[PDB]
Amino acid sequence: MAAVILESIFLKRSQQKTSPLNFKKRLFLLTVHKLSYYEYDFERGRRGSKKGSIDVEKITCVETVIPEKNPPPERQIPRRGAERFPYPFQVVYDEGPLYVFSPTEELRKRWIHQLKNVIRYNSDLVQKYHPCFWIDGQYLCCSQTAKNAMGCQILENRGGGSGGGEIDPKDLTFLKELGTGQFGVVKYGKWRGQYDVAIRMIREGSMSEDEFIEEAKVMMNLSHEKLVQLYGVCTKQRPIFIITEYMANGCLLNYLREMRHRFQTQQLLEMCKDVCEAMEYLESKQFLHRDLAARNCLVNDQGVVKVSDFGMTRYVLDDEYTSSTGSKFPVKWASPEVLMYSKFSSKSDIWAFGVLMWEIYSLGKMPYERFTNSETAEHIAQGLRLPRPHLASERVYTIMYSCWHEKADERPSFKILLSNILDVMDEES
Ligand SMILES: C[C@H]1CN(C2COC2)CCN1c1ccc(Nc2cc(-c3ccnc(N4CCn5c(cc6c5CC(C)(C)C6)C4=O)c3CO)cn(C)c2=O)nc1
Ligand SMILES: [Zn+2]
């Protein structure tokens, strides 16, 4: 008994090369599972038989379509403010694009919104799309001769949807606790009892909410297989929620400290590759993490590590964590220029990444265990560096050691570190 999210009568266009285009009226049903269209008995006002359906999980984008240059009377905007259907929108999926015409502009805006609410958790959401129709075996925007051609224009939002990231909490279900972080409790749940999600309940007074909500517009569009995805936010309540991807195995630091796993060195290097891939992607987007550490990484059910809580440090209101000398400040992961002058940059993240590799190959051991936070800050500025873990070969140690140079300009980039890791994987394996 799946809930029907919407119910409307649309003008569905047939999906073809030399075949004729036919438009027919259909009743579309939208659920969390499928998007189906039926025949409609208008005289009896009754839904007819089913003529087709599309898997929700297979939809990659929903957006409007540039109207036709010379449409027929049935699909023209009226000259004077279920007969007319002059407002089209497209649903992109493997089986080419489905084109649906709406009678009113407001109705089209409601379906694109609800459709996005239903596909925002899909893993195949695209960042490009064809803003024009597909006619004569070709696209009118790019002239590609394949319905599965890569999008020719950039979408304003990942997966379409034209805020757009406002998830309604009535469809969320809390099922299990996941602990507490800097912003409060985090729980495991499902959206419409289907898509697994993690719900971050932000304690009031712990986050600069207004500043983050402005950045969530950009973080939502960031997507990488090794990056914990941000789905949306719930900001019409107290406290607000942040819906993100769910990671079953949890924190990486704890994951490394369970001696039962008995990791192989190949597994440890794969963890470094996963993180490096995510940082390289953030590096390409001018995005900084500012707090890279094993504690801030997560592991999924398949043992894949993903970077999480990237850029969230700029909104922490706790001074004990923001101040360079606060008890919560990550002194043991900060570069000398950060502790001395607060000079943050991509190279400061490279330093933390080198410490992250040291944590992975040390199986969650605290760095500079014999030193306190104050003792570490004074000694790392003099030349104190972490030793080579026992499970780390000399070549692997050379990679993490290169991240700890005195001059930030002398440290490698995430693009070079990935090449170094991929090189070791190809030789030491
Ligand atoms: C593995 C099982 C084991 N289980 C035992 C077995 O019986 C009990 C307990 C549960 N446990 C478990 C399972 C799954 C998960 N998954 C998730 C955890 C978290 C999570 C939870 C609590 N605190 C945090 N942190 C920690 C980091 N951080 C936070 C906010 C900020 C930071 C850094 C900052 C200062 C920049 C700001 C922050 O919120 C996080 C990471 O976001 C987030 N996401 C998306 C998840 O998917 N975690 C734990
Ligand atoms: Zn195109």
Author numbering: 1 to 16, 19 to 83, 95 to 175, 393 to 659
The authors write:
The TEC family kinase, BTK (Bruton’s tyrosine kinase) is best known as the target of ibrutinib (IMBRUVICA), the first-in-class covalent kinase active site inhibitor used to treat chronic lymphocytic leukemia, mantle cell lymphoma, Waldenström’s macroglobulinemia, and chronic graft-versus-host disease. The TEC and SRC kinases share the SH3–SH2–kinase domain arrangement (the ‘Src module’). In contrast, BTK contains an extended N-terminal region (PHTH–PRR) consisting of the phospholipid-binding Pleckstrin homology (PH) domain followed by a Tec homology (TH) domain and a long linker housing two proline-rich regions (PRR). Membrane-induced dimerization activates BTK and we present here a crystal structure of an activation loop swapped BTK kinase domain dimer that likely represents the conformational state leading to trans-autophosphorylation. Together, these data provide the first structural elucidation of full-length BTK and allow a deeper understanding of allosteric control over the BTK kinase domain during distinct stages of activation.
The first step in our redesign was to lengthen the linker between PHTH and kinase domain to reflect the flexibility and distance between the N- and C-terminal domains of BTK. We inserted GGSGG repeats that were either 22 or 32 amino acids in length. In addition, the new 1PHTH171-G(GGSGG)4/6G-396kinase659 constructs included PHTH β5–β6 loop mutations (Q91A, I92A, I94A, and I95A) to prevent formation of the ‘Saraste dimer‘ since that structure is associated with BTK activation. The structure of the PHTH–G(GGSGG)4G–kinase bound to GDC-0853 was determined to 2.1 Å. In the structure solved here (left), the longer linker between domains allows the PHTH domain to bind to the β-strands of the kinase domain N-lobe instead of the C-helix-binding site defined previously. Three PHTH domain side chains, R133, Y134, and R171, provide key interactions with the kinase domain in this new structure. The Y134 side chain inserts into the hydrophobic stack created by W421 and Y461 on the kinase domain N-lobe in a manner that mimics the L390 side chain position in the autoinhibited SH3–SH2–kinase structure. The guanidinium group of R171 participates in hydrogen bonds with the side chains of S453 and Q459 in the kinase domain. The guanidinium group of R133, in contrast, points back into the PHTH domain forming a hydrogen bond with the PHTH N130 side chain while the hydrophobic methylene groups of the R133 side chain contact I397 and Y461. The total solvent-excluded surface area of the PH–KD interface is 753.8 Å2.
